[PDB]
């Protein structure tokens, strides 16, 4: 979207990965499988939760009884009251509507950023030892077993292993 990752150079998402928002899909001699990025996913959940909570928690209201009664000879102040009520209605409706539109735009870009960053993290980790397919996929030049895939997720990937 804004970061070119989600619905970008990574065209689609994985219905298979159900344990997190962002993750990996390994493919070696020991089989295949999906696996969410524990730390990366939890961080978004925390921040997104905080976001939703901020939008809600910041609305601290007074104890008020809207609604007034006026007799047939107080139509003016009745309409004054009606004006202040409709005045607040237009103000809150507009802000609320726009707040949602704005925050939604940002949130989607927030996820795009997290995916793009997770890719950059791995790519700048295995420079030569693997080539970019271009689909958010890395093809290993050196055989990579399961305990090897681990050193990539944990971000603890040794290098000294360049082959051909």
């Amino acid at each position: 979207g804004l970061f070119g990752a989600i619905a970008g150079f990574i065209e689609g998402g994985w219905t298979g990965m159900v344990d997190g928002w962002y993750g990996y899909h390994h493919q070696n001699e020991q089989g295949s499988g999906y696996a969410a990025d524990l730390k990366s996913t939890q961080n978004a959940i925390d921040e997104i939760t905080n976001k939703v909570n901020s939008v809600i928690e910041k609305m601290n209201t007074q104890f008020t009884a809207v609604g007034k009664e006026f007799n047939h000879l107080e139509k003016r102040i009745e309409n004054l009251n009606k004006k202040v009520d409709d005045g607040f209605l237009d103000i809150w409706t507009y802000n609320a509507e726009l707040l949602v539109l704005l925050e939604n735009e940002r949130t989607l870009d927030y996820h795009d950023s997290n995916v793009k960053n997770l890719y950059e993290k791995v790519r700048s980790q295995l420079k030569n030892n693997a080539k970019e397919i271009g689909n958010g996929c890395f093809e290993f030049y050196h055989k990579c077993d399961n305990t090897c895939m681990e050193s990539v997720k944990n971000g603890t990937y040794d290098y000294p292993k360049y082959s051909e």
Binding site: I6, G12, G13, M59, A65, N71, V100, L102, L108
Partner: protein, 322 residues
């Protein structure tokens, strides 16, 4: 041997709008808009509302023969009238500062009704029994407000009366009284012998002299005469004085009262129940943490801001793909 990097997806159909794009399907979302009420009138802080049901404030405080339900509750968070509750001031007249009174009574901390001027001992020189009318019927019989007494002459004699009450409660006392305007100068002397009369009410802050305006008003509930209703709050330690040579509808019951501002009055058919709520609407109570609600503009309590929106769906997940 390949390793791919991707994102979540699911069967979700939730859509949300952005500044750039409408109807965007997302994996997860929350609704910021509360659009759900329990269709009930519930209790406010911890106290229930005062339900007049058949009657309106006017009828309730004056003591209309129809609003004779209960020894009413000593406190209430707000007041509930029904859109069809008609029984108020049965005798045609003008309730002065009625709206102001309703506001002052909207929410009360303590509220005990007492007999300010005992019927038996208070008026020895005037008739306190003949004061009934066909405009205020209670089971076929002619009757009148319970909290007021229509003092008429005692056999061709209406001596200048003078009664005073001194607020010995610890709180404000709400005192109500009426002034009667006969239709004809004959009805005038028929009721209070004297032709040229006057009524005077006075306290430390209140003071007003009343002159009966005698004339034929168009028939209302059978009455060509009128009766205006007045009220005032007597501060603790203060005293109020009544004085009349006729036409005075004297107080019988008053109200020791302590009020807490910040409430109002709901006109609704919605049933009252035994439940808690932090926010009340004429359509029902609202239990929510959300910032906005589109249920009703007129609200009572600590409520969400009323919005014209139909849906405020906030995206939490990401775009949904297969």
């Amino acid at each position: 041997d390949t390793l791919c990097i991707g994102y979540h997806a699911n069967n979700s159909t939730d859509t949300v709008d952005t500044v750039l794009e409408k109807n965007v399907t997302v994996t997860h979302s929350v609704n910021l808009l509360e659009d759900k009420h329990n269709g009930k009138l519930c209790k406010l802080r911890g106290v229930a509302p005062l339900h007049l049901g058949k009657c309106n404030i006017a009828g309730w405080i004056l003591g209309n023969p129809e609003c004779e339900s209960l020894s009413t509750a000593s406190s209430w968070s707000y007041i509930v009238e029904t859109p069809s509750s008609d029984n108020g001031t049965c005798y045609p007249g003008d309730f002065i500062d009625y709206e102001e009174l309703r506001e002052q009574l909207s929410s009360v901390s303590s509220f005990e009704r007492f007999e300010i001027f005992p019927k038996t001992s208070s008026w020895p020189n005037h008739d306190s029994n003949k004061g009934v009318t066909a405009a205020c019927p209670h089971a076929g019989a002619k009757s009148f407000y319970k909290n007021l007494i229509w003092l008429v002459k005692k056999g061709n004699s209406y001596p200048k009366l003078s009664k005073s009450y001194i607020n010995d409660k610890g709180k404000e006392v709400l005192v109500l009284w009426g002034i009667h305007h006969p239709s004809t100068s004959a009805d005038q002397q028929s009721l209070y012998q004297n032709a040229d009369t006057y009524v005077f009410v006075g306290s430390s802050r209140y003071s007003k002299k009343f002159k009966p305006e005698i004339a034929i008003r168009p028939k209302v509930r059978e009455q060509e005469g009128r009766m205006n209703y007045y009220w005032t709050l007597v501060e603790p330690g203060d005293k109020i004085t009544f004085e009349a040579t006729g036409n005075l509808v004297v107080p019988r019951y008053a109200f020791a009262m302590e009020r807490n501002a910040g409430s109002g009055i709901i006109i609704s058919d919605t049933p009252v129940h035994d439940c808690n709520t932090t926010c009340q609407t004429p359509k029902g109570a609202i239990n929510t943490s959300l910032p906005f609600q589109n249920i009703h503009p007129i609200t009572i309590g600590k409520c969400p801001k009323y919005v014209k929106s139909t849906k405020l769906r906030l995206a939490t997940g990401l775009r949904n793909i297969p």
